[model samples]
Target chain A: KVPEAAISRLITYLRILEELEAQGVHRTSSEQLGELAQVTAFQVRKDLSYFGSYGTRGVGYTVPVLKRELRHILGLNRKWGLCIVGMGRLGSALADYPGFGESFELRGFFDVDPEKVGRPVRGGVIEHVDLLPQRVPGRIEIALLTVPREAAQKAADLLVAAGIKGILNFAPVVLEVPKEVAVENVDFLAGLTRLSFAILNPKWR
Target chain B: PEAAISRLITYLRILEELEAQGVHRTSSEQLGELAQVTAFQVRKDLSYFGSGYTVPVLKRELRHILGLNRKWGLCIVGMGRLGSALADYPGFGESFELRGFFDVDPEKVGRPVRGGVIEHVDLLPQRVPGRIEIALLTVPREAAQKAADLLVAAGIKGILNFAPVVLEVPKEVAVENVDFLAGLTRLSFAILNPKWR
Candidate 1:
């Protein structure tokens, strides 16, 4: 069985290859890739070999060739429609964020506050969470749960009820949902804390 | 060690909460329960510093290990909604200081934020060398790479990239990308093939 850690490594690898291709670098070896990602070359070869034999014995993997394989393997080749469940500061920031590629689109925005409802956002105005059943089920497949800890579960329940298949949760609290709906947590504090340690242990990093 | 860093953060938070409750002493058993790990694991994690650590002593060491005792100077690269929002962060007490804010827009430049004024990013050459070490890159997708170039050129040591782009930096520069879409995509795969994971 493939490890969850490998999946994250794959994402990082894909991003690395993307930057490599953008720089017009045609080829890369596990040694170079490993160094860039701060991993061992053996780990790089081992992880890629899990998907399939990718690189040549000496010449190594071609940037675009390996990048395409990673894209398809990760199901990132297709478009995924996403909506924001809570249009708070983080949600609003994400809505205006133009960094996400074409694969993911900000299709809708939702909020429980009457003051925020009907407010303008990326693709459309921020709609009430009550309208999720009518607006989200058919249009969006992913939801960004950016509400506070107290409102996270309630908002998650509403999104699940509206047929959301996946959720990227930003709140610290865990949301209880059906097995069919997948939930991913994004902890801001964890990132900061990690940065703190990284700053302290530069050589180890 | 990466996992250990995360656990250290949790342990630090737990110690802070306990200290607030007026609890002076704690054992490995109590810490392990809150951290959801075994007493042995808790002791091993703390073993990095030493053994036989009291509650206050362990908390102090954890803080020091996490670089919480050192003051870190940080700046925001893009003064967009996210940048503006981060400027108002309620955290960043004594340990983290937000000293500079930069933007390219003339309208935003010289605008006062929480503790500092929004200066032109061009000023980074003069202001960033010794004053700032870390940067929060919140610029647009197109501007991210170029913005990072400026930061690195200006001698920024680490970057917390809020954008979706993977940055190209020197070996010495540390970059941490914050990806929300990657999390969603991972969730998508999990939802599509529940048995695969």
Candidate 2:
């Protein structure tokens, strides 16, 4: 498995490459790329080497080639089916989020509210809680849970039972998922509190 | 108190803007202006990141080191309207290196929108080449799990999930979630019950 730090750095490199490509820069060196991406040349070279030698000894690397190779390695080539639970503002916002559609397909949306059920959101239909299993099917592999904090875990249980393997939870509470299933938590308060702590304790560093 | 991770993103955004304007150097005071935080707070956070740059004396250069000097590549998943908006989001592009947008929609397959090439999800594993390290998970809640599983399978180690759901991954994976409603809820609670503060 790749180190998290290295993965983060790779994301940085990819972003820089995209900008360079837009500017029509065809050739780039590790040192230049690292500098643009805010990493050390040695670090950049080390990371690039992990994916095989894409860099030429004297000529550096071809922009489009490197870009394509990076995409392939990161697994951005396939289409993933996703679903959303809860139809509140945040849930609805996510349901309509242009970013999600760009990366994955929204197969269906689920909510417990009677009023919200059967409603159309952002061109997609929101189904009642009971219809989750029926509407999602096995093809819908990913799930986003935006239900209330109290209901986060229960919602997760429902999704797990439905054969959903991965979940992005928006509820503030920490959730427990099966070992095979992946659960990512979006704790807005936790994150904010961490930041505030840093701000309050500037001397910690 | 808000989490430090979210603030870090905010700080990153401010620093990126500074870098793009050709301002290669900055101080906590300047960062304060951009991020609306105190200079001391900026210094503290920079220190937490283990930044080598010193503050007070070298605050200007330090800001650059803390923000623009670091490299980051962002791969956005779920190319819905928000994903597309983010890809073309001028605010994010100024500082972030948006590698490309990914989606599972056949209609969007192989299409180029706003200068970004949209590729199908299947190509992610091999196409990623492990170069695009950080993934921004923006897929719907239902797809969050599958998308993350695929991301991990593809070798992505760090993920920033935008979906409003909980997701699990290997302990080795560094996953961060962005939930706006939770923030609003906390804010509302704080407003309603001042004693909780």
Candidate 3:
């Protein structure tokens, strides 16, 4: 973790490079990448120094160099299997939201509704939430908990029992797992409330 | 300057990651790295949420700091696809409760959702002040301002906006935006180069 903000800048830089690479632009200097990533050139080089010491002195970093290095640092070097535990509208939209290929492969969806269980959504068959521990794909690493608030914890428990490590929780509850499962609470309120503080008090910004 | 709330989410995410990793208590330095900020910045950020725990690292204190303490009373505006989806999501157990829903569509106005009535949007000014504290705005961008004005007028304490527009709200009232574009952008980076902590 080379200066946490630097890591965020790295994420931003990766986005810049992905767009740059798509335009067929190969090599670029830290100055250019910095401009796009919204950081100073010095900050860019400082970030690269920790995880990517590959940039030439004057010429700067290249798309391929940064891409490969970033993939390793950010844990995106290989494909990751994903699972969604709910099949509601947001869950359905999340299950099929395209633009992911090698990075994240959504493997399946889970639900207890008899109408949905054994039935197929967009990506895979809706399996029983209880069957998660046994039926979860071998490659599945993370999960999206979209069950109702009342069921979020139980579903999360099931996912943890199923051997998942990372979780992107959609429910508003603070899920408790046995200290190995990373839960990223995707609470819209959290995001919105964050904005509210700034609005309520500019100094909070 | 990034919004404090955005950093709050980052803190919540990193803190969640740490708690999962068996990190019992931590210093600003460790928390800072996870958030991509300095220890000083981390201190300032966490200060807003108070000392999180008794020993400064009790781990589970993150939920309270992140406002997941089951104190929210949220109402969903505009019973559309997104609204209906939200109406069904079990919220933060008791910390955050989904109170009711509002809509303009005649067919849904009197219908049952979860257990509450699908009320008319105009009724917000009458029924919302006492019953609901936060309003989740899911209406379209075209109608977002109108709905937000109504929400503010109805005396809502906070709002979680989903429309892809920047809502102008009063200082006393808080507003948070959750847009598909933002989520998609994050997803784009995540799928290509994801990182939890």
Candidate 4:
């Protein structure tokens, strides 16, 4: 398994490459790349080395080559299908997000609202909650839950029946999926509260 | 006895608010009072950041040392409703200037939002010019990987991800995920299952 820190760094390297590519620079050295990304050169060499040494000794790594390689390693090359369950501000904001189309195709959105059903959201149409199993294509493997706090668990159950293997949940509730399925949670308020607490007590450092 | 990672957020918030109030000079005592933290703790956090503030007095001058004196240029990717909301978010206005906004939508590509105009993702490389150190990601979880991919390609070093999924990036890139569900889960559990308390 890749170290969590390494994974995070990989994300950084990819971002730097994006900037470099935009500037029309095709090649970057470990030292230049490391300095730009705020990491040590040795750390950069070591991290990229884990995925195999793609960097040249004197010439450095080719920008496009490194970018493509990183993308493949991070599962960005394969298309993943996703469904958003809630149709609220947060849910709607997610539906229209630009980044989703880059790696995953948003199959459609789901909600119980009679008004929202059949309505187009940022190009994708919203389907009724009951139609999730039928509306979600077989290709969809991940479900993103943005339902009300109370309905989060029930929604997960439905998504499971729809054959979802992984869930990136946005609801503020803890949900249980089948043992084989994976769930990643995003808790905004809790993080803010922690930040609040940390502000209240900073001397602990 | 909580983890130290959480304090960074608090420090960020306090500094932001302090900067907003237009209060250039502040002491540990004042910061502690406003943020509800202890003076000693405030001093220590600044110390950890390698700030050199005189003890017992002259702590307000530490702001210069902490780099809080200058404005940080912040960019937001994905100009959907949430992205727009974040772009116009008042909290970031004090310390961070919302310099650029990008989206893939052709219609939104050239539109002006609030003071900042929306640009296509293709413009990111040239648009983010100088001193734009931090980026706030408000894209969808599905699109997060790609948006981040583009942002990485664009040269953003520090990122604040508002998406709900985990993303992979280089180690040097500082990606702080604002996990809304994780926060809600912990809070909900704390409220319902008091065992945590």
Top candidate by DockQ: 1
Give the clash count for each candidate: 0, 109, 14, 33
lDDT of 4 by residue, B89-160 (tens): 445544457788889989888788876688788877776657565677877677988888878777776577
The TM-scores, one per candidate, come to: 0.68, 0.48, 0.60, 0.52
Please write out the lDDT profile of model 1 over residues A53-113, one tens digit for every residue. 7775777889988888888777777777889888888889888766577577778888888
Winner on TM-score (1 vs 4)? 1
DockQ of each: 0.29, 0.04, 0.19, 0.08
Per residue, candidate 2 scores C-alpha lDDT tens digits across A1-205 of 3333454456567657877997999978888988776666877887777667777477788778777776555444445577888666557767765544233577888888888788877767888777667666656766777676778889889887877756777665778876556665554323322322232334431
Ranking by lDDT: 1, 3, 4, 2
The CA lDDT at A57 in model 4 is 64
Each model's iRMS: 4.1, 16.6, 6.3, 11.8
- Which 10 successive residues of model 3 chain A have the least lDDT summed? A196-205
TM-score of chain A of 4: 0.83
After best superposition, candidate 1 residue B99: deviation in angstroms? Answer: 7.6
Which runs of model 2 end up more than 4 angstroms from their true locations? Answer: A187-205, B1-197
